[PDB]
Design a protein around this ligand. Structure first.
Ligand SMILES: Nc1nc2c(ncn2[C@@H]2O[C@@H]3COP(=O)(O)O[C@H]4[C@@H](O)[C@H](n5cnc6c(=O)[nH]c(N)nc65)O[C@@H]4COP(=O)(O)O[C@H]3[C@H]2O)c(=O)[nH]1
Length: 285
């Protein structure tokens, strides 16, 4: 919950930015402070990364007494060519690139000093998880110029991040599809579902191959316990809105669930969305 809350905090600071300033310049202190907190950093800088994957040497923000940035330092070059966190384990100790879901490297965290007892894989993993999610947000919410649905774009980018979270870090997420089969209750059920949206959850309102309303809900960074806690909350909400006498199911709601796993193979998510939920590739990528 700490990660989710840290990310929601950042996201809100992004939403309230004037839109005059670049997110990365104006929120640099906050981004670095966030990373410092999770890595127990002591000496570090945050740097803009250019188009061509080179770093701008003048830092956006520093922590402690960070020395000048060795542009062609081995750790820095390796990090930026590989697009992944690299460390010196076994001047700089760790470099963490901030890479979005499309592989654009937006920024670079360069770590001079962190306590040795946290200089390990557990810590490197939190740093890499946080960096990727910050990256997405820095290019995110103020990004609606493409003539596709804003909602549709944010849904698929969040889904792509949760897939990386699963694949790379074993982090769990859950997708629900609510298929609404009764036209009498359809709109009112979907409105109830829309109003329940919480935290980093994202939603997409769709119509399937049989013309029925389908509400997709993605629960980022949420375990199997938790997913069940969500459906439990949701059932209480349906009981207030409609009969406590009645169940979700008696309103024409069919629930489909897909758990994102490190185990879940390649085209498993694809089979879930299409030829199962009956959606297509123009609704989610
Ligand atoms: N992804 C996702 N998961 C969900 C959702 N609803 C419930 N869960 C899961 O169900 C657990 C219990 O939820 P609760 O009864 O609402 O009990 C919650 C609730 O009373 C409170 N809480 C947590 N987040 C919020 C929030 O964003 N707004 C409000 N008003 N209360 C919250 O803290 C208790 C424990 O919350 P958690 O530790 O998060 O633990 C949550 C969470 O793991 C949802 O819309 N999306």
């Amino acid at each position: 919950q700490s990660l989710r809350s840290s990310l929601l905090g950042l996201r809100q600071l992004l939403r309230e930015l004037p839109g005059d300033e670049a997110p990365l310049d104006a929120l640099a202190e906050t981004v670095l402070a966030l990373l410092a907190q999770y890595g127990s950093l002591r000496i570090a800088g945050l740097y803009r990364v250019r188009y061509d994957r080179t770093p701008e040497p003048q830092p956006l923000a520093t922590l402690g007494e960070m020395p000048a940035l060795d542009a062609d330092d081995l750790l820095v070059r390796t990090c930026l060519e590989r697009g992944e966190l690299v460390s010196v384990r076994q001047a700089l100790q760790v470099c963490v690139p901030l890479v979005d879901t499309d592989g654009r490297i937006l920024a670079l965290l360069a770590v001079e000093q962190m306590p040795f007892f946290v200089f390990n894989e557990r810590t490197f993993s939190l740093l890499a998880i946080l960096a990727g999610h910050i990256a997405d947000l820095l290019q995110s919410d103020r990004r609606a110029l493409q003539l596709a649905d804003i909602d549709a774009q944010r849904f698929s980018q969040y889904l792509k991040r949760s897939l990386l979270d699963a694949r790379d870090h074993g982090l769990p997420a859950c997708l629900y599809a609510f298929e609404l089969t009764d036209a009498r209750y359809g709109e009112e059920v979907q409105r109830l579902l829309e109003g329940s949206q919480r935290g980093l959850d994202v939603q997409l309102r769709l119509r399937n191959d049989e013309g029925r309303r389908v509400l997709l809900v993605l629960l980022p960074l949420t375990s199997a316990e938790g997913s069940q806690g969500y459906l439990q909350r949701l059932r209480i909400l349906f009981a207030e809105r409609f009969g406590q006498a009645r169940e979700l199911e008696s309103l024409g709601v069919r629930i489909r669930q897909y758990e994102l796993d490190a185990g879940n193979d390649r085209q498993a998510l694809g089979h879930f969305l299409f030829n199962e939920c009956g959606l297509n590739d123009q609704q989610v990528a």
